[PDB]
Amino acid sequence: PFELSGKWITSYIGSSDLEKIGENAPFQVFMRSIEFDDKESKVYLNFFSKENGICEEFSLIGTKQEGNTYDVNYAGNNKFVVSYASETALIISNINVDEEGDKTIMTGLLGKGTDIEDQDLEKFKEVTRENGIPEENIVNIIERDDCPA
Ligand SMILES: COc1nccnc1CC(C)C
């Protein structure tokens, strides 16, 4: 009834560690598209990220493992789930484990373009909360996004 597959833009991101989300850090992500293939139990993700100031396109394949949990390799291991959805937004949560074993909790509010409504935003905060991340580690990331469409 509400196809989650489509164009998605990163509006906000929660994070247990502000350094992982900083300018050029591995988590300053900017989504572009998300293909869910419930058939093969996977998920295609096309998204940009900066390094030294230049954009980098990434097209990752997520694997659906037992539960609402998908798997993807990037910056270390990653585990995420759509903690919630509405027609207008997509709030994700991902447990990253870095190439040094550091644990990090993030929340990511996804939507179609710049128009986020208070309902979804209020929701995201709640889930960031429920995930144990400071309400204060959320930051606007779309304004940063200078990567290609
Ligand atoms: C490719 O996407 C991902 N890969 C690993 C973990 N989380 C995501 C979701 C984004 C929106 C932060």
Q: Which domains does the chain possess?
A: 1-149 (2.40.128.20)
β-strand pairing of 42-51 with 30-37: antiparallel
Q: Is-contact 91 109, C-beta < 8 A?
A: yes
For this entry, resolution in Å reads: 2.3
For 100-130, letters b (16+ CB in 10 Å) and e give eeeebbbbbbbbeeeebeeebbebbbebbee
Q: Is-contact 30 9, C-beta < 8 A?
A: yes
| Alpha-carbon span 82 to 69, nearest angstrom | 9
Q: Is the dihedral of CA 110, 116, 117, 123 positive or negative?
A: positive
Cβ–ligand 1 contact at 78 (below 6 Å)? yes
For 43-77, letters b (16+ CB in 10 Å) and e give bebebbbbeeeeeeeeeeebebeeeeebebebbee
Helix (H) / strand (E) element for 78: namely strand 76-85
CA 93 to ligand 1 centroid distance, Å:
8
For ligand 1, what atom is nearest to the CA of residue 79? 6
CA 114 to ligand 1 centroid distance, Å:
19
Cα–chain center distance at 2? 19
